[PDB]
Amino acid sequence: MTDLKASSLRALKLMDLTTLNDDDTDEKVIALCHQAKTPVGNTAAICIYPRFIPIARKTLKEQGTPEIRIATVTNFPHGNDDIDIALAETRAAIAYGADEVDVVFPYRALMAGNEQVGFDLVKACKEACAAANVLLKVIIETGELKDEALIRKASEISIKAGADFIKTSTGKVAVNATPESARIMMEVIRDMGVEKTVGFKPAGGVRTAEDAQKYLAIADELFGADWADARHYRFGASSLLASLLKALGH
């Protein structure tokens, strides 16, 4: 047993195994579901576009892993400031059968000085999700926000509005998760004293076992090594799984 082996098994079990591509099909999503069932255990979740939720649910059930959660995305990837649209998409995700909805915060509106629309958008989507026993993650798009003060503010607004998780990135812009962005966002969780109710999810560009290991190190430093369970930590990733399995001998 090695520190890398220990972190890699932990990371595997925290993955939101993702496919969000223009050419996605049912077949591709079925294959993803099979990939999430590994010889050492299951990923925490899959993350797919809403229209694929019903076929994914059926696939996960037939292979005997109904406990793999189904996450999806709304207001995505653009993070527009139309609350009605974000909410309608979130209600549709719930109706398809999502376990978790990852909504994009209206980051450009924040950058232009409008803090209120992000509060209102997150709150509206949280209310819909909580009524359905669905978890809400909020994607703030740290690579577009760029400045520490704006990363902190988007995190704070999201948490105040009811986010169950704060997530770095869509994976669809040039810059996604970084260790510094992860530290900033986790410091907000710490500063607001919301460790019990808010998780953290780095997403985009987390490609290798060693990458995953960098992010868990930060969590363990800040909150102790027991904090990062599946309710409090996820990896938004794809290729990372194969890297983790190699680190583990599988």
Side-chain angles (χ1 to χ4, degrees):
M1 175 70 47
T2 62
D3 290 355
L4 189 51
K5 285 191 191 193
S7 62
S8 297
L9 185 62
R10 282 167 78 197
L12 181 153
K13 295 178 184 197
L14 299 172
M15 275 187 62
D16 287 3
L17 178 64
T18 300
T19 189
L20 295 168
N21 301 299
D22 282 347
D23 63 343
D24 283 346
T25 65
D26 289 352
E27 295 104 286
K28 282 166 167 163
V29 166
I30 289 172
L32 192 81
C33 291
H34 297 333
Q35 185 182 188
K37 185 190 183 186
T38 90
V40 302
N42 302 149
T43 66
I46 62 171
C47 183
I48 61 182
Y49 285 119
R51 66 191 180 274
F52 302 112
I53 295 167
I55 195 51
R57 185 75 77 189
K58 176 174 189 165
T59 305
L60 292 172
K61 183 191 182 182
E62 293 189 352
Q63 71 180 19
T65 68
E67 72 278 30
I68 300 178
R69 309 149 179 85
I70 306 175
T72 193
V73 292
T74 65
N75 207 35
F76 182 101
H78 43 271
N80 291 342
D81 65 1
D82 186 321
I83 300 159
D84 293 338
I85 291 179
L87 180 58
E89 297 180 340
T90 296
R91 291 197 306 273
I94 293 164
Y96 274 123
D99 298 313
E100 309 181 345
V101 171
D102 297 20
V103 66
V104 188
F105 188 90
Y107 62 83
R108 287 183 303 271
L110 178 65
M111 292 163 77
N114 184 343
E115 298 182 1
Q116 190 67 45
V117 68
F119 182 88
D120 293 343
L121 187 151
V122 173
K123 184 164 180 168
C125 292
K126 173 62 178 296
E127 287 182 358
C129 288
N133 301 306
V134 167
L135 280 197
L136 184 74
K137 314 200 195 80
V138 178
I139 302 163
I140 67 167
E141 205 74 289
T142 56
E144 294 300 306
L145 291 170
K146 294 173 187 201
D147 297 320
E148 175 177 355
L150 282 169
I151 294 170
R152 292 186 185 281
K153 186 55 61 178
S155 298
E156 181 187 15
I157 293 167
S158 296
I159 288 165
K160 289 183 173 180
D164 301 310
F165 276 77
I166 56 174
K167 172 169 166 165
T168 61
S169 312
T170 59
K172 304 301 186 180
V173 295
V175 177
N176 298 285
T178 68
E180 184 179 10
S181 289
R183 183 176 298 280
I184 295 162
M185 291 179 68
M186 292 189 273
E187 287 176 347
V188 175
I189 294 172
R190 177 194 68 187
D191 293 347
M192 298 182 73
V194 294
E195 294 88 329
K196 191 169 194 200
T197 55
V198 182
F200 175 67
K201 177 173 170 182
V206 189
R207 293 216 187 132
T208 68
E210 299 77 359
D211 289 337
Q213 184 181 36
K214 292 173 194 357
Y215 287 101
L216 283 176
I218 297 170
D220 290 350
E221 171 201 336
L222 288 172
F223 298 127
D226 300 315
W227 183 76
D229 62 21
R231 173 62 182 86
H232 297 84
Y233 206 99
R234 300 290 179 71
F235 289 100
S238 58
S239 81
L240 177 63
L241 183 52
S243 178
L244 295 171
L245 285 163
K246 184 181 186 232
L248 293 165
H250 296 272

